[PDB]
Amino acid sequence: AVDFSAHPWKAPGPNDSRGPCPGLNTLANHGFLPRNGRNISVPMIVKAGFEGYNVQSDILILAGKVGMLTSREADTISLEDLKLHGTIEHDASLSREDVAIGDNLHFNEAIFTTLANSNPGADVYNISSAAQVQHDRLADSVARNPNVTNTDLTATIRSSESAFYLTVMSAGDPLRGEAPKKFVNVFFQEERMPIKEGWKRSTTPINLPLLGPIIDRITELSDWKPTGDNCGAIVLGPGL
Amino acid sequence: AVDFSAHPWKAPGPNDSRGPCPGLNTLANHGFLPRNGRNISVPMIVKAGFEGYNVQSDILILAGKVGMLTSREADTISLEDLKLHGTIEHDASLSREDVAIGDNLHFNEAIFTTLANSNPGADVYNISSAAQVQHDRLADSVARNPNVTNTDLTATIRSSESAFYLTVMSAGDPLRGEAPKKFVNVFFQEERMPIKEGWKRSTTPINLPLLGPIIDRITELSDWKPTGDNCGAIVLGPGL
Numbered sequence A, B: 001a002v003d004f005s006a007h008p009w010k011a012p013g014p015n016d017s018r019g020p021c022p023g024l025n026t027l028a029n030h031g032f033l034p035r036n037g038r039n040i041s042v043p044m045i046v047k048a049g050f051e052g053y054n055v056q057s058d059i060l061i062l063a064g065k066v067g068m069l070t071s072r073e074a075d076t077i078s079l080e081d082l083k084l085h086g087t088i089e090h091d092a093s094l095s096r097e098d099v100a101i102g103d104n105l106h107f108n109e110a111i112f113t114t115l116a117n118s119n120p121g122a123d124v125y126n127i128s129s130a131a132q133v134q135h136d137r138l139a140d141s142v143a144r145n146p147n148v149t150n151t152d153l154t155a156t157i158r159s160s161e162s163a164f165y166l167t168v169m170s171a172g173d174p175l176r177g178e179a180p181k182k183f184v185n186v187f188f189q190e191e192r193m194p195i196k197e198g199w200k201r202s203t204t205p206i207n208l209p210l211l212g213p214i215i216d217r218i219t220e221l222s223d224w225k226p227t228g229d230n231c232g233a234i235v236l237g238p239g240l
């Protein structure tokens, strides 16, 4: 029984490491991960994701070990390391700019406008709105970034990230693939768990069987096509 | 420093986990890594490679974290996990068969014949012989394997592996890029440190600055050329 009162939100300090991921940033901001954002292992991510969000080890082990590639350390990262373009970090993010034409690390309100204005007339974001947002963000990158990378891999990662905001920030049934806008907006804009606002950790485990169909449905509805070579190669370490 | 007398060679039993890598298998056979070949983390690899071979953390962290992708565990592998084709394990190996046409895991004497007969007339293997062997092994895979994969990435990994046998099994000066055949043959054929034969751990650290030029020279002298998509995508986990 995690006591969320024992995990208060605190804004990061000047020497706290933060990355392009609102999920991990939010866990650090509540002390489920180290508040300094440093020396974070995959076991630590597994535990934090379980405690904070009820996200299970299947997805966190897979994504965590890919994330470990971004650091120079044997078995840890700093959250900022995860900005390394072409490992996980990709163009056509929901709340960050493309690395070739801007800042791929920090929350950007102008970029976030697209998500914030989605699913007009409803009080939730859902699978169809998530797909529309992905379509529109990719169109923006294609229009403004001549170095855009858009592949089967990046498209799948992008749908995974949309599935995450729809499930982790849901009103309590992640299967629904819908989340209150008031929760998701706090998650992105403040990297805070919207506890005041009425959010509670899912009592349903969020695992790959739960996320998989949501991911695939978002992709299907997004009118997606690859760009260029469609090469699914990742960057294997920093510096290279 | 390191007590090699506390690290005797013992042949693996039928249940001991062993992989396609003679470097890690040899460390396990001397107990620098667990003799059962299981529950191995990147920190353990870093320590074992330092103690056994004077290989430094830079290369072992980079390679080790890519190797961790081959298991389902948060921060460990079994050595056999590393056989996963298309993460690190590749066609045109020095001592193993290609997975599409044979056994990509165990030492194979028929395959090893090419390396064993290289640098005729000399008592060492060196950079030019290593390059010739790589050329010949790739030609063999191209001739006989209808699913052969040959990319910039696999070529670089193959040259890295050649650089490893030339440096770790050297007669004490790894910069020379040459190793006694009597040492290298024991390393491959027995996965044993050739201590009775007169081998000693390098007193010179083996790191990426040392290996990089050897790797690049081997590639250069092998007359390597791209043969197709040349898409350097790795497999990011088992079962995918």
Ligand code: HEM
Pocket: A020, A021, A022, A023, A024, A045, A049, A053, A055, A059, A060, A061, A062, A063, A064, A066, A067, A082, A083, A088, A089, A090, A091, A092, A093, A094, A095, A096, A161, A162, A164, A165, A168
């Ligand atoms: C295994 C652990 C994790 C790793 C290594 C990781 C890594 C990343 C990285 C590198 C990005 C930036 C990609 C980009 O937009 O360019 C990202 C984005 C994202 N992550 Fe995570 N993540 C993890 C876990 C989670 C969790 C548990 C959530 C839960 C809500 C989450 C939600 C998101 C979202 C919504 C984005 C999109 C941000 C945007 O498009 O602006 N992640 N993640």
Ligand code: HEM
Pocket: B020, B021, B022, B023, B024, B045, B049, B053, B055, B059, B060, B061, B062, B063, B064, B067, B082, B083, B088, B089, B090, B091, B092, B093, B094, B095, B096, B161, B162, B164, B165, B168
């Ligand atoms: C960082 C840790 C290591 C990992 C994860 C690793 C992984 C691997 C893998 C998966 C292979 C098989 C590739 C193939 O031939 O298809 C391989 C081959 C090889 N490794 Fe390692 N290795 C590591 C460290 C070392 C060390 C310290 C040496 C020292 C001599 C070494 C020497 C070799 C050699 C010579 C081969 C070629 C075998 C052949 O072509 O038949 N490795 N390694």
Ligand SMILES: *[C@@H]1O[C@H](CO)[C@@H](O)[C@H](O)[C@H]1NC(C)=O
Pocket: A038, A039, A073, A076, A078
């Ligand atoms: C943690 O990460 C830093 C790099 O940010 C590294 O220098 C340090 O050795 C790591 N280890 C600790 C403090 O356990």
Ligand SMILES: *[C@@H]1O[C@H](CO)[C@@H](O)[C@H](O)[C@H]1NC(C)=O
Pocket: A119, A121, A122, A126, A127, A128, A129
């Ligand atoms: C998303 O919500 C909108 C507005 O209520 C609705 O028209 C649409 O059908 C919903 N889509 C899904 C997948 O529920």
Ligand SMILES: *[C@@H]1O[C@H](CO)[C@@H](O)[C@H](O)[C@H]1NC(C)=O
Pocket: B039
């Ligand atoms: C695996 O290694 C961990 C960490 O060192 C240890 O706690 C555990 O007992 C090991 N398990 C086995 C099966 O040896």
Ligand SMILES: *[C@@H]1O[C@H](CO)[C@@H](O)[C@H](O)[C@H]1NC(C)=O
Pocket: B119, B121, B122, B126, B127, B128, B129
């Ligand atoms: C390798 O050894 C052979 C035989 O002694 C020699 O001809 C060749 O020049 C050597 N190559 C290098 C790079 O030393």
Ligand SMILES: *[C@@H]1O[C@H](CO)[C@@H](O)[C@H](O)[C@H]1NC(C)=O
Pocket: B100, B146, B147
């Ligand atoms: C191997 O290549 C043949 C064509 O020569 C193809 O029919 C077969 O599907 C390939 N197998 C794999 C594992 O891709």
Ligand SMILES: [Mg+2]
Pocket: A020, A089, A090, A091, A092, A093, A096, A097, A098, A104
């Ligand atoms: Mg991005």
Ligand SMILES: [Mg+2]
Pocket: B020, B089, B090, B091, B092, B093, B096, B097, B098, B104
């Ligand atoms: Mg192989």
